[PDB]
Scaffold this active site. Sequence first.
Site, short mmCIF file in Angstrom:
data_model
loop_
_atom_site.label_atom_id
_atom_site.label_comp_id
_atom_site.label_asym_id
_atom_site.label_seq_id
_atom_site.Cartn_x
_atom_site.Cartn_y
_atom_site.Cartn_z
N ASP A 1 -6.92 33.33 -40.24
CA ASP A 1 -6.29 32.47 -41.43
C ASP A 1 -5.01 33.00 -41.45
O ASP A 1 -4.60 33.98 -41.77
CB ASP A 1 -7.18 32.74 -42.58
CG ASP A 1 -6.72 31.91 -43.56
OD1 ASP A 1 -5.70 32.20 -44.45
OD2 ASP A 1 -7.09 30.45 -43.80
N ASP B 1 -1.87 38.41 -46.31
CA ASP B 1 -3.21 38.31 -46.93
C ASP B 1 -4.11 38.85 -46.05
O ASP B 1 -5.18 38.08 -45.42
CB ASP B 1 -3.48 36.77 -47.09
CG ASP B 1 -4.56 36.31 -47.87
OD1 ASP B 1 -5.36 37.43 -48.53
OD2 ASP B 1 -5.14 35.26 -48.05
N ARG C 1 -12.12 38.33 -45.34
CA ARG C 1 -12.47 36.88 -45.31
C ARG C 1 -11.73 36.14 -44.54
O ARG C 1 -12.06 35.05 -44.02
CB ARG C 1 -12.21 36.34 -46.85
CG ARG C 1 -10.71 36.30 -47.22
CD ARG C 1 -10.60 35.89 -48.69
NE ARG C 1 -9.37 36.26 -49.12
CZ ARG C 1 -8.99 37.52 -49.71
NH1 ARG C 1 -9.86 38.34 -49.93
NH2 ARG C 1 -7.70 37.85 -50.13
N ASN C 2 -10.51 36.69 -43.96
CA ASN C 2 -9.68 35.92 -43.00
C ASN C 2 -9.68 36.61 -41.54
O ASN C 2 -9.01 36.14 -40.77
CB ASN C 2 -8.14 36.10 -43.68
CG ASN C 2 -8.06 35.53 -44.85
OD1 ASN C 2 -8.53 34.29 -45.27
ND2 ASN C 2 -7.22 36.10 -45.77
C1 LIG Z 1 -10.71 27.83 -40.01
C2 LIG Z 1 -12.10 28.45 -39.89
O1 LIG Z 1 -12.17 28.85 -38.37
C3 LIG Z 1 -13.43 29.24 -37.71
C4 LIG Z 1 -14.61 29.42 -38.46
C5 LIG Z 1 -15.67 29.85 -37.67
C6 LIG Z 1 -17.20 29.84 -38.01
C7 LIG Z 1 -17.70 29.85 -39.67
N1 LIG Z 1 -18.76 29.87 -39.55
N2 LIG Z 1 -19.38 30.14 -38.49
C8 LIG Z 1 -20.87 30.45 -38.29
C9 LIG Z 1 -21.32 29.64 -37.07
C10 LIG Z 1 -22.83 29.88 -37.06
N3 LIG Z 1 -23.15 31.58 -37.11
C11 LIG Z 1 -22.65 32.23 -37.94
C12 LIG Z 1 -20.93 32.02 -38.03
C13 LIG Z 1 -18.42 30.08 -37.39
C14 LIG Z 1 -15.52 30.19 -36.16
N4 LIG Z 1 -14.33 29.99 -35.54
C15 LIG Z 1 -13.33 29.50 -36.38
N5 LIG Z 1 -11.89 29.57 -35.59
C16 LIG Z 1 -12.14 30.07 -40.52
C17 LIG Z 1 -13.07 30.22 -41.63
CL1 LIG Z 1 -14.37 28.88 -42.07
C18 LIG Z 1 -13.14 31.50 -42.40
C19 LIG Z 1 -11.92 32.64 -42.01
C20 LIG Z 1 -11.15 32.20 -41.11
F1 LIG Z 1 -10.52 33.34 -40.89
C21 LIG Z 1 -10.99 30.99 -40.39
CL2 LIG Z 1 -9.87 30.78 -39.14
#
Ligand SMILES: C[C@@H](Oc1cc(-c2cnn(C3CCNCC3)c2)cnc1N)c1c(Cl)ccc(F)c1Cl
Length: 294
Positions: free
Chosen positions: A170, A149, A153-154
């Site tokens: 992801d 995948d 988005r991931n």
């Molecule tokens: C599980 C989740 O993890 C995270 C999300 C985020 C994230 C989502 N949104 N933001 C915003 C924070 C404020 N500034 C803009 C981005 C940071 C950062 N680190 C992560 N490890 C996630 C999400 Cl939500 C989307 C795609 C991914 F591949 C992953 Cl792995």
Amino acid sequence: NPNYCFAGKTSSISDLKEVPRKNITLIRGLGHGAFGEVYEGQVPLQVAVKTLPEVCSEQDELDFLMEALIISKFNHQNIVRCIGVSLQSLPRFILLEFMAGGDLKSFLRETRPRPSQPSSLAMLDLLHVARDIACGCQYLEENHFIHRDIAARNCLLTCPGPGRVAKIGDFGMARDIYRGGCAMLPVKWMPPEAFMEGIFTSKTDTWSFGVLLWEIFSLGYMPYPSKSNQEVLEFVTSGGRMDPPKNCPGPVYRIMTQCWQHQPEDRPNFAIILERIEYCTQDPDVINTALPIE
Ligand SMILES: C[C@@H](Oc1cc(-c2cnn(C3CCNCC3)c2)cnc1N)c1c(Cl)ccc(F)c1Cl
């Protein structure tokens, strides 16, 4: 309790680093995905917190565990780190490296060059993202792990600004297949043998990476604009491929079309993809190409 094997080692739930729940603080929601919420948190170590709904099935619980095992076993700079887990309290947590740049699709759409933000991004920024993710994919390939995948988005970015690093974030599809619905399959990222025969190899990810490249250089468009999943399935099976993204340099489009060869044996492995991306970064005519301004 389920086991997980990666490379030459088997791991168990007992191998996950349990972080005491008292040491974990939730700061803000980050836009909560499909099944479960995501938070910015602190352990001070800044983390993303992925939660498991307390209202879930037994299979949901095992899926959540497996995801933790999978990510905890990787060791590469372009794959998000797992800080640890909190599985002994409810709701259950997985703690990840916090990527302040957010996911790549949202970043590309929000950071598109604009009359207000004229030079928000350049061709070299895009090539560096592609290179980062390709280096993560090469690590997976050489360790015999099929992601299944690969898509914008991931992927995540360490930060919005110039020093950003892109990482694969992801692994939900890989986790499911490891042990669904047609409408939930990422068919627009899948090669013919994948959606027709359910055959997956390292060359599966090569095809998907080609589609990611198109997402990157289109600055966050959905692949196969105006086409539905079934329309894409028939289009791609019949030999149809996407046109170059707007303003896309020929050398970059050439990588996409090589990733999309019908026969998997004709598609490059990630070592070759990395070489070709590096050659694009060296070509002034590529990196001096202006991105479109919305
Ligand atoms: C599980 C989740 O993890 C995270 C999300 C985020 C994230 C989502 N949104 N933001 C915003 C924070 C404020 N500034 C803009 C981005 C940071 C950062 N680190 C992560 N490890 C996630 C999400 Cl939500 C989307 C795609 C991914 F591949 C992953 Cl792995």
